[PDB]
Amino acid sequence: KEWLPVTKLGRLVKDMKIKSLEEIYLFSLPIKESEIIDFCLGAALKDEVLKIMPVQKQTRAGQRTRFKAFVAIGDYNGHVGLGLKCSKEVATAIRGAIILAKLSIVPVRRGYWGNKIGKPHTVPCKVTGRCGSVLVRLIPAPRGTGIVSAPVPKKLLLMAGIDDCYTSARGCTATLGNFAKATFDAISKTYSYLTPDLWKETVFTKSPYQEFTNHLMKTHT
Amino acid sequence: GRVRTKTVKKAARVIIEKYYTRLGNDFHTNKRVCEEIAIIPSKKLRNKIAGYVTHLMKRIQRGPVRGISIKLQEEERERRDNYVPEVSALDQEIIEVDPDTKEMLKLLDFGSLSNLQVTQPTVGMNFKTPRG
Amino acid sequence: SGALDVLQMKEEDVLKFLAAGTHLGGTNLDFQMEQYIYKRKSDGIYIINLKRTWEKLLLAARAIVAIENPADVSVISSRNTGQRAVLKFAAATGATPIAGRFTPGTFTNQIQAAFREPRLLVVTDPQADHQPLMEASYVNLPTIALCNTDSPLHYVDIAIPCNNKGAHSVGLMWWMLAQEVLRMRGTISREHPWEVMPDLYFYRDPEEIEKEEQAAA
Amino acid sequence: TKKRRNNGRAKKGRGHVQPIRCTNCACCVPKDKAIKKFVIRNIVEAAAVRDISEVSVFDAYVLPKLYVKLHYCVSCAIHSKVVRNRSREARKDRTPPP
Amino acid sequence: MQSNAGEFVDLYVPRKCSASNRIIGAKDHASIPMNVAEVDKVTGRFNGQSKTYAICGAIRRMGESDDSILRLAKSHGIVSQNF
Amino acid sequence: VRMNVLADALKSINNAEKRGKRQVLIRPCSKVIVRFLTVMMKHGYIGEFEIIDDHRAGKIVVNLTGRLNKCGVISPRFDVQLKDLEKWQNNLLPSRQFGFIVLTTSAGIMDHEEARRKHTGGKILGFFF
Amino acid sequence: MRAKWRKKRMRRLKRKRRKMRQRSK
Amino acid sequence: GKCRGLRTARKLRSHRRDQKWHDKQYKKAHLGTALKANPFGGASHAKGIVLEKVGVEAKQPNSAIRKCVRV
RNA sequence: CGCAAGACGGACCAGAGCGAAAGCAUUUGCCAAGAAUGUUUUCAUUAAUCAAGAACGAAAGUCGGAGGUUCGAAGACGAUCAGAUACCGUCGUAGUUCCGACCAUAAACGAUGCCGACCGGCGAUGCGGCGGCGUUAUUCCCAUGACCCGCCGGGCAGCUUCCGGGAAACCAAAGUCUUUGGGUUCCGGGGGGAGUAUGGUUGCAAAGCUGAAACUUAAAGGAAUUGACGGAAGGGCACCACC
């Protein structure tokens, strides 16, 4: 139950000294410890397995049937991840995919349809995201519209915290691998889209590695 | 037939890493070292370990071995920390300077120095290895 | 670095550059490296512009001094010509060396024991050290490179145009780079030229080690 | 699928080329297409250059060579092991092997 | 980023490339806020203050990160104007 | 051949954004291009430009920022009413927050939010967001 | 069946239909 | 579309009108050949006379007698 | 050794050129044509793409005349085989060759319409131009050629790469695409039925162009992957392999 961390970032996350993962996302640091997301988004974070997909390689004599598990993750205001783990038993594939969802969680940017009143409820602009042939357009909807989409990206957008949203998917959407990553690529490009609101310059604040280097030289070997 | 397996060669590269001070050239002395400084559950495998130990130990009497990193190879880095030559190869008073390298220094502050020899260009400009 | 006569191209350093052959570059030119070369000679040698060689090494020497822990500068060479030079620069500056055999996945794999996580890299050649430049693209690692006239600027952030092919023009460009970084921390004053001789930073040919004993018998 | 970037041949801006009759077969292979060997060779291989020089009239008379250009089709180059099935990467190598 | 009260609402304002003006993605791991030292006018030493640049992932793998540093440092007066 | 001079000149400065050129050159100069770029400049998606006179069609070097996501052209020039201006801006632009369809009106070349103010429809030029 | 000979067997078969329409015309 | 000219309405309309015949379900409901050879002639139900009861053999792996009626 | 014939134009010969494509290779003469480059010439929008309409269009095939060396559908025979009316061998008809009319099709392929713009690098080559030490021939100097260092324009290509794209293979185009619009022509809509039936039209004919339906069927198909197999190429090993 300890998690004695390995990476340089994971050390400060144990110390209760880096108090936001928005400070991690600002400097584009690779989260490669499972318990960084388990730390911040601990008690809110909901896991749902999209599909168990039994893959086969034809070998010398008989098939080896491995099990691919697509885990959608996210607290219901800002953060989402889509992890895939292929394993020989399903209960380790389900277990391993929940970890791989967390390492690759993003914050969703959320903006407004027309009037700018209250909290944001929708996608800030129109964003496309794709892998394979599956193209998933996200479209900003007015308040109380709901996620007007397939069951699957709704499961990732109900986890994103985006309440109201339109979609226009195009491709072999039957394949849940390409379809879940397309809609995930879309909600990752929400914060990587330069709106005219964000022309105001980046003030370069200090990196979590730059400041507490004096801590990094006294706490461990 | 006699090719040392990884369970022989890894006991060979950890015993020398830790207990280099205790070992020697003689097999029968460091056959007996391996009893005190290791728990080897076989009579035979101990000799397999202690055999290739003495092979590697005769190599560390010479120079650097690949998969070993000890306190004495640290001392070589400390010994080779302190090499001192005679006044340098870079402090000559005849230094070969091309007219085109005389031209670029003339656009710098250091146009004409005390200790350079300017040359004439190598006409007959053939510098490409032909095709085929 | 600019319009400070304290950090201006010194007179005793140009006479090192001409003897070492740092100006005396390669036979082919990379399109990314046109800005750092004055003129192409006859017999195909690109004359590397020795101010713009100097100027780039100052900004490189700045970014090393802007690291508060002087140990998480990962200083890497794979080829013999700068295996010693990096291992001495690591002692001088206090930086971390990997001199020969850069294991792929050192910066990227956690469970590997050789998992150092640096803050700035210094590269002897972007091709010889192609591998450190790509593991610098997975974890946020800026890059100093000892660039050549033909060597590429793929994943390098502060290029230093030098003759890193030549034997005595690698250590001479580790000498400028070891000195400059040490002065700005407040160790070496610009009063006295540095105690360390620039000939320490040279990889010695084992042919010329079995020769030096015979020569100096 | 398109296995080669060229069409296993050496026309790029022609439209048409003259056909060659193969040496092993009499196949009609395009000239640029055909596998070609300019075979330069001594009249004897190794064991007979000893004795034919011994019973020669002239003192150290160098013997004539045999300059013939062979044209193999794809089927008769791979059967006689002139060319060979390289790996999907190593096909690209247009380097004549030493 | 305001609401209709004027209060800042979005959960983080991401960084932006100093060279190309393109905002760095939350997982663009080839993007790096390189810190350049500051020198005392006549002492010739690290002041303790720095010059901080962001160059996004696409520029490093384009091979233009060091042309941009050479141009940006010139505007901050680090590299000599003449050069 | 070159049949839409405004189409080439906006594609030429769209490729420079996606690549990351600090400034961009466009070969022929319609007044429509300058009138397009002034609407881009007053909204401030691009920096200042200077036209380059040769006794021909003019050349223009536009100083780019990295603000412009896409610079579009709608060929053919669809004649648009005020009722239909909503349909054009609700599919062609990203949101109801930012992005500007500039379309030529009898009150001169101007953006869509101003065409709602001035109360004048006209022929669609292109867009930028 | 090769698509070249399938064609050839349609060409003979059509030839036989012009042959047998002429018996009525 | 391909041709986008502002005065290309009759081509863009007429090209679709021709290429819509290449749609299978259009040509089933716009040539009267299907409506001719529809055994009901466009009815949802039809009354007929049972003249023989015929047991139809089920097709692929399903081996069974499908008890049909000729009407 | 001579001779007569009709073909063909090796090696030189290339990821070289030209031509709209098909195609095009002995010497010279002749007759028109053409791009690229050069241009401080001239006209001043004359242009792009194109239903209909047309020119050309490998091979085979058709008609007539001439010619028939080689090769060689059909065909004769000898083998091979259970059979071979096939491959293999020797012959040989049409043809292959030319002249004048026909035919209009090819995996006629880069399986990639044409015109335009923009977006990386790299080393070559082909044609013209421009400029630069020196080497070389005309020696008795200039200017030309040959090389040698580059540059520009145009062309055929090549390598490279997180340009980006795409199902991928691959592609500086197949890129500039849900951030969806430069112009324009043809064209496809699950597999079959079927390029069939039918009607027109073309042709001496063979056949071309246009061209459905009833019905039938739950898949056919693309790129890639793992295996099994090969009368594919290797690299091993073993007295249940040989030597």
Domain map of chain A by residue range? 1-107, 108-201
Amino acid at A179: F
Pull the structure tokens for residue F70: 């896409």
Query: Which of chain A's residues have a Cβ under 8 Å away from the Cβ of E22?
Result: 194
Residue of C nearest to A5 (CA): C110
Question: What's the domain count of chain E?
Answer: 1
Closest nt to residue C137, judged CA to C1': I162
Domain map of chain F by residue range? 1-68, 69-129
- Residue from the list A104, A119, A210 with its beta carbon closest to the beta carbon of E9: A119
H or E element, residue C24:
none
- Residues 1-20 (F) near nucleic chain I, CB < 7 A: 1-4, 7-8, 11-12, 14-16, 18-19
F33 CA, I75 C1': separation in Å? 79
Pull the structure tokens for residue D91: 């096909």
Pick one of 3.40.50.720, 3.30.930.10, 3.30.450.20, 3.30.1370.30 as the CATH number of F1-68.
3.30.1370.30
H or E element, residue B97:
strand B96-97
Amino acid at F46: I
Backbone phi, psi, residue A166, to 5°: -100, 160
Q: Which residue is nearest to nucleotide I215 (CA to C1')?
A: H37
What residues contact residue B78 under an 8 Å CB cut-off, 6+ apart? none
CATH, range F69-129:
3.30.1490.10
Contact F97 A112 (CB under 8 A): yes
Disruptive mutation site among F90, F95, F96 for chain A (greatest number of A CBs within 10 Å): F95
Q: Please give the distance of CA B3 from its chain centroid, rounded to a whole number.
A: 27
Residue A74's Cβ-count burial label (10 Å; 0-12, 13-18, 19+) is: buried
- Polymer length in residues for chain H: 71
Distance CA E43, CA C79 (A): 37
Question: DSSP assignment of F78-102, as one string?
Answer: -EE-HHHHHHHHTTSSS-SSS-B-E
Residue of F nearest to A123 (CA): F95
Pull the structure tokens for residue A176: 């849940």
Measured distance between the N- and C-terminal CA atoms of chain D, rounded to whole angstroms: 31
Distance CA A133, CA A126 (A): 19
Distance CA D33, CA D72 (A): 10
Distance CA A74, CA A161 (A): 8
User: How far is CA D10 from each of CA B131, D30, D79, D97, rounded to the nearest angstrom?
Assistant: 19, 10, 22, 19
Closest nt to residue A168, judged CA to C1': I178
H helices then E strands: how many in chain E? 2, 2
Contact C76/C127 with Cβ under 8 angstroms?
A: no
Closest nt to residue D78, judged CA to C1': I233
Pull the structure tokens for residue D27: 């196949």
Q: Which fold has domain D1-98?
A: first zn-finger domain of poly(adp-ribose) polymerase-1 (3.30.1740)
Q: What's C155's DSSP letter?
A: T
3-state SS, residue C32: helix
Contact F123/F79 with Cβ under 8 angstroms?
A: yes
Query: Residue C123: which of C89, C147, C104, C149 has the closest Cα?
Result: C147
Distance in Å, alpha carbon of A183 to nearest chain F alpha carbon = 17
Measured distance between the N- and C-terminal CA atoms of chain C, rounded to whole angstroms: 46
| Sign of the torsion angle spanned by Cα atoms F15, F21, F23, F26 | negative
Query: Residue A6: which of C115, C120, C140, E29 has the closest Cα?
Result: C115
Residue of B nearest to C54 (CA): B108
Contact E41/E64 with Cβ under 8 angstroms?
A: no
Method used to determine the 3D structure: cryo-EM
Chain A within 8 Å of E21 (Cβ-Cβ)?
A: yes
D16 CA, I35 C1': separation in Å? 21
What residues contact residue H33 under an 8 Å CB cut-off, 6+ apart? none
Query: Residue B104: which of A94, C40, F27, A151 has the closest Cα?
Result: C40
- Residues 21-80 (D) near nucleic chain I, CB < 7 A: 31-32, 36, 38, 69, 78
Give the residues across from C46 on adjacent strands: C40
Tell me if C1 is assigned to some domain.
no
Contact C186/C87 with Cβ under 8 angstroms?
A: no
Query: Which of chain F's residues have a Cβ under 8 Å away from the Cβ of E59?
Result: 20
Which resolution in angstroms does this entry have?
A: 3.1
C125 CA, I175 C1': separation in Å? 33
The reply to whether CATH 3.30.230.10 applies to domain A1-107 is no
Contact A78/A106 with Cβ under 8 angstroms?
A: no
Give the residues across from A111 on adjacent strands: A122
Is there contact between H19 and strand I, defined as CB under 7 Å from any strand atom? yes
F27 CA, I155 C1': separation in Å? 25
Pairing of strands A134-139, A79-87: unpaired
Distance in Å, alpha carbon of E38 to nearest chain F alpha carbon = 27
Mention the CATH class of domain A108-201.
alpha beta
Distance CA D34, CA D14 (A): 16
Distance in Å, alpha carbon of A106 to nearest chain E alpha carbon = 7
Pairing of strands D35-39, A63-74: unpaired
The CATH number that applies at residue C145 is 3.40.50.10490
- Polymer length in residues for chain B: 132
Pull the structure tokens for residue D46: 């190794």
Omega before F76 within 30 of 0, i.e. cis: yes
- Breaks in chain E (C–N beyond 2.5 Å) sit after none
- Residues 28-87 (F) near nucleic chain I, CB < 7 A: 69-70, 72-76
Distance CA C138, CA F19 (A): 22
Q: What's C104's DSSP letter?
A: T
Q: What's G24's DSSP letter?
A: T
Range of the domain at E1: 1-83
D73 CA, I69 C1': separation in Å? 27
Pull the structure tokens for residue C75: 């200083």
Considering only residues 33 to 92 of chain C, which have any Cβ-Cβ distance to chain B shorter than 8 Å? 38-39, 41-44, 47, 49-51, 87, 91
Closest nt to residue H28, judged CA to C1': I213
Contact A130/A167 with Cβ under 8 angstroms?
A: no
Longest dimension (CA), chain A: 64
Pull the structure tokens for residue D83: 């060319």
